[PDB]
Amino acid sequence: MIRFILIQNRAGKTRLAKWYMQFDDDEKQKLIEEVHAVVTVRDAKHTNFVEFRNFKIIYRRYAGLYFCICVDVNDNNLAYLEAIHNFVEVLNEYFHNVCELDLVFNFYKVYTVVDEMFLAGEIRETSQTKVLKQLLMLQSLE
Amino acid sequence: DGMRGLAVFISDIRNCKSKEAEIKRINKELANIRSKFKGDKALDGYSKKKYVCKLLFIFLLGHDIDFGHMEAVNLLSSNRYTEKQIGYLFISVLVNSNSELIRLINNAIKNDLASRNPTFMGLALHCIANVGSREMAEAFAGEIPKILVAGDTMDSVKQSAALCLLRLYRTSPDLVPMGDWTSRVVHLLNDQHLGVVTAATSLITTLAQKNPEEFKTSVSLAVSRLSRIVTSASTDLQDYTYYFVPAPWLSVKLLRLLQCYPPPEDPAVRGRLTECLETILNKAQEPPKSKKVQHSNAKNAVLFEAISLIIHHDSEPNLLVRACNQLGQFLQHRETNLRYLALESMCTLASSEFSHEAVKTHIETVINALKTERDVSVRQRAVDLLYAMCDRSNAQQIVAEMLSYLETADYSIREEIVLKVAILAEKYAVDYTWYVDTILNLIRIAGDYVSEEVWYRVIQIVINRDDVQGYAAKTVFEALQAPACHENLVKVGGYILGEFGNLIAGDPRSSPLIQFNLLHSKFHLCSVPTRALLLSTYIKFVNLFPEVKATIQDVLRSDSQLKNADVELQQRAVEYLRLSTVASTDILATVLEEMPPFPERESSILAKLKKKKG
Amino acid sequence: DYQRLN
Amino acid sequence: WRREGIKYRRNELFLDVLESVNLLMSPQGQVLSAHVSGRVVMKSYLSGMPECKFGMNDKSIAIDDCTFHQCVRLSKFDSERSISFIPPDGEFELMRYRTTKDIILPFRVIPLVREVGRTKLEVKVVIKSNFKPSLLAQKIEVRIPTPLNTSGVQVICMKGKAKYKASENAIVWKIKRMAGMKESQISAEIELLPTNDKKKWARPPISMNFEVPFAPSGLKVRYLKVFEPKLNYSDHDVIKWVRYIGRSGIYETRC
Amino acid sequence: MIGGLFIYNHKGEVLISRVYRDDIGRNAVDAFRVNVIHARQQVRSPVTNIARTSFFHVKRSNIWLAAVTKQNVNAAMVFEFLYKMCDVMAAYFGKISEENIKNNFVLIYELLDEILDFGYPQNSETGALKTFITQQGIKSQHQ
Amino acid sequence: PDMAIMAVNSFVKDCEDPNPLIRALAVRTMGCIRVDKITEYLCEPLRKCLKDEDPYVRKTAAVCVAKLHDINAQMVEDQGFLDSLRDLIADSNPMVVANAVAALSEISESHPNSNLLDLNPQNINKLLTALNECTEWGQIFILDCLSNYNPKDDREAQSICERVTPRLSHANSAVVLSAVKVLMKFLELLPKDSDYYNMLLKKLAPPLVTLLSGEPEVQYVALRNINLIVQKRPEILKQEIKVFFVKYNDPIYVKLEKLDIMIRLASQANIAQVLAELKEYATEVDVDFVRKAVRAIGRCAIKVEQSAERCVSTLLDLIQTKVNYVVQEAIVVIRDIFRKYPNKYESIIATLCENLDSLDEPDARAAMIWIVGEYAERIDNADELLESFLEGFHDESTQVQLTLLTAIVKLFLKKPSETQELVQQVLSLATQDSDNPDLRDRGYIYWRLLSTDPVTAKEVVLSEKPLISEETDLIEPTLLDELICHIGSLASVYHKPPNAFV
Amino acid sequence: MSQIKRLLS
């Protein structure tokens, strides 16, 4: 299963944090610090997969953002690597030329996108168009 | 949408120039919202919403909120979506303990599950799944299965309820029995909406870990679904077709589920599966249907999970071989991601008879990788591979390379690496002269990173094997001569020459006197346990070599030895002294007799590797 | 022992 | 270090001052080496994190060496406005200090040795209090070391209870209470048997233990103003009690 | 002698670094951060050893100045050098902080070359090396 | 390293140009990039720079020698630069000879046991003349070399000692410590003569004292070294005990070390004021300091008689606190008191046995176990007491195991009838089960001893011990000697040989 | 520096 999903910027501001198992405040803060310290220094030469305690984190860069999923050691690395892209592509079609600030000002919306595609640590929806069907239709309604 | 004021507020934070500008501005908004919540009338819904969402943003910022839980709870009960959405989201993030709030929350969830509006049901389910509280299990863990099956609830709802029940299983398994739903749940694999399949698959997968016989029916259906997926054409399943690939993530999940079981009971199903698998192998070798990287990543993802199934069953040798050659190709491939993955996957192949010899063909490329890679994490998987493929034939060269890796390898791994070599050498010991050597190299190389258990073992072996005793005596004595000498060498060599110094005392270069005088150069340099050992070893000499007795007795009678600040060191010094002074020939020599052999046991070296992951 | 302070 | 909002039914504080008075004294009666080690504990139970300014008679003279708790800040753009700090809730060690000058010894103890050849040995030790006659010294113990060859001892004491301990090679004289400027006496007769006649008995000193309710530095607490901006209350509102306890430490004599 | 001089912030990010020797791999900068900066015990000593790698350190406000070597250096000499380094930065750019470090990317490294070649402390004073070092234009007066 | 090779032609043209100041730039960069390829182009520039009209180019080129020594260093040009650096030691400027000495010293580490072979007066007199002139740091390098040198006889030692004697130095730590290293090796000159020895030790005390007026980090370095200096010759610092009293805001590392020194400098006289300090130290804030203090109270009892009763009494008062680690550190030191003063302190045992329920530290358990060993006959229930540990003999420290074995047999030799099954069990565990071959050893040793002859066994194990005598955490005298030779260096901070860090 | 930079192409 997914342990958590982070979206961090270069600086260390954590623009999205979804936790899929209850850590302490202090525990979380440290996970945030750790994920950052590892990921930021690693060039495109380095792999997208990094073991980390006896979890492992998948990450991918897009602009100044880092999209990090934390999974069990037995979970499929590449599957999750492309699920990241699946998600980011949804965000781009939903925000039309998506950027970092789009997620700041519409944070409450980002969470809505995340939760359609991932729930309780596992993947929910792979179908990009179907997510957008549930986003646009049924954004409208008050 | 909107969020009146939110935009303004976030713009103000960006417009801040400092830590104190940020802070004072936030305390302003907090006071505003608190003045407005704390008895400043009943606001309309949009108002409540806009303020709660601001508080939510404040908390996400990193600054701590001590109110507005009441207010979020209000929003849950609205029939406007946007109000509930902010509301549910708020409590999904800022969790409270209070018993009157957990109650109100639960009643708010229940009255949403009470509607047959799938949207409101949605937010309630998602809420349960994302916080997973005991109290929510105790409330709903009964009602969740019922909604998943039984009636015509919507497709989106079946997805959420599947994963919701999965979470509740994980959190509170005592509240998920194995009831009637069993049958109907499995049939969800045959639903038109693939998202329901995607969801249900993952729930069955995890439930089968403790209930394989209960979900046994899944096997047949899982197969026929997967083979129908890899058979379908370019514009079939258009919704769930990612970068010219059929339902990649679902394929993976189904393959995952098949690993929760042996190979299939029935001939016809196993036929369909192996046919399907041969096709998956073929599709990888086929030309890339796009230039863009997402295609190859997603396709290979499926390939690897298939390989995992092949290795899990350990059945069909044809497949085991094709997998080996395919993974073979990936070992030199330009993507670091794929190399890392291939070394990972091959490790599990190696511990299988039908495959073991195929793995060995590529050994040189693996060794290439270990030396070349300019990473670490990859190089580590390369070593992990070598270890795993290592048997009788390889050991010779594998140990040599592992030894050379240890030289430039980082500080933290060393301990692990040392421990690994010391197993391989012990397990595949052709000539135990090579074992003794290998261990002694590990000492001069690491030694710091040796381990007590490791050096315990070499001595156990040495005294148990007979023939190598002379070798040990010579090599040990000769390596103690060299000046840049590590402590654990003194320990091993001390004990060994105690027992088998007689096997080298013929030679005038390695006399009794020379052996003792050599050891005593290291006596003051070493720690207490080591000094204690050298003391045992010193009286063993007094028995073995009457020629040197005079000299050893003067060192034992020295004030530093007899009045030694440590207990053991003074106790041993006196006991051994009184033995040599008083007693008789035969009473001494019965006490200091050849030493019986060690009985057979597990490796404490194995037990320590196994300890190191937990 | 305890005395009081201005 | 004083986290969140503190809440109590009535805002009071307690000060503890703990001093150990160390001393070596010559047989004639000469103050040859002596210091006082000291420490100030504050047990403040008050609502909302406040500011405090603490004062005492340093430079009515006396103060060698000292250190504070990290909460204290001695400098705010140069010099000092006494000790100035933002106290943690409850019990904490405010400061720790030493002093040597204006020494104030609670007891003076006076030996009288008189040998009859090498057979008998006459002893008379007198103790005097040197503090306020109104105040209450407790847990007094006086240990007179007997020789290593001792046949038997005879002891009487004018106030208290005393006994010769064979094992510990000492007469132990205990007094449960003694007030200032008063006098008491013990007299002892020690019997001997001479063997070696050259290892000249390195006469161990007479030791004393005592608890006193005064600070034997001369230090006393002048004031401690408590200020609170957020809330209403201040220094007239807080009830303040101070306690001095003089632990013995090492209090020798007849050396 | 000195085979690495690293300067950190309080959080443990690397402000400047200068490896002088083959003996010390780059991972040593991590080894300082891991085992001392973020040690569980704040009750240690100045001199630490890890993997036969010796770690000298001295703090100024929130800035760690750290020296690294595998050799048996004159230990007094290393601290002495670090002190004379902290004397130089004051007369050249005032207060000891992260702002003054970010200003002096150019200065720090040029000072490192003049005072320290291949681990040996050369020589140091404000006068004798004034026009032998090139600075800037206007300093840091803010804070 | 990858960047530079492509344009090597620049740095050969740059070291040749006029202007003497900007010729060191090219010279130092050339030596820092490390390749085989660069040896092709470096040989003849390095030759010409070593005698330059200006001292700046000579300074830098003398360094580039030791730079080249890291890379493929076995050349006829390296035999040329052996000459080129030694002739540069008799050089007019101090900044040139300083670097020559530094490079050459570091090169001496590539040792065939025959490198820079000290040529006595001709080598020495030039160094002792240059040492007076030399730059702040140069003095260090020169002195660190002098430590290799050995003299033959008395005047040889003297005429070097007299030259360095003026070292109450400017570089308060760096120089002084290195000078002590020299002065302490050259200290065999009529073990005490009439006048020179008895005055050299008078001159060695005050600059050690005023080392304490430097910064905290060099306070630490100095105190680690002073710890050694006091062990070898304590007569240097005899009544300076008053300096090493722990001042209140001293940093913890300094506190710990000063405390140790205090103990060694304690005597029959000063003990009264030393304890006065110790009692206070015991009540302090840092745990590790508290430990070292209570340990030190015990160390006093052992170092000086009469203070025996006092120290023990305050230690018992400390046990009564029921602060766990206080009790554990105390009960450890009480072992050693029983060893210096046997059969005197028996009565305590009872009070000790109260606490045994809560001893998690290995040292403490072993202490208690041994106490039961020596005093089995007096403790009725020794049998049952030792029996409590056996349950978990494995999952227990090697120190405990060995002591337990020894203690049990002590009991058995004393109480053979009421002990049978106990010894059988422990000797079984020590022999069959045990994984430390050295433990198994001693198992067999004892089994064989007892089962052959208990008449003899009694005489061997329970022989009257000698006394431990004032040692009190003392260092191994032979190792100390080696450590003294490394005084200024890192080994003196660690109290381990250089052979414990390659 | 360009929080503002677009996430894909």
Residue numbers in the entry:
A (entry chain S): 1 to 142
B (entry chain A): 8 to 621
C (entry chain P): 1 to 6
D (entry chain M): 161 to 219, 251 to 446
E (entry chain N): 1 to 143
F (entry chain B): 81 to 582
G (entry chain Q): 2 to 10
From the paper:
Crystals with similar morphology and space group dimension to those of open+ Pcore were also obtained of core, but none diffracted beyond an ∼6-Å resolution. Molecular replacement clearly showed that the core in this crystal form was in the open+ conformation: this was not pursued further. These data suggest, however, that the open+ conformation is accessible to both core and Pcore but is likely promoted by μ2T156 phosphorylation. Thus, it is likely that in the cell, unphosphorylated AP2 exists in equilibrium between open and open+ (and possibly other) forms with only the open+ form compatible with μ2T156 phosphorylation.
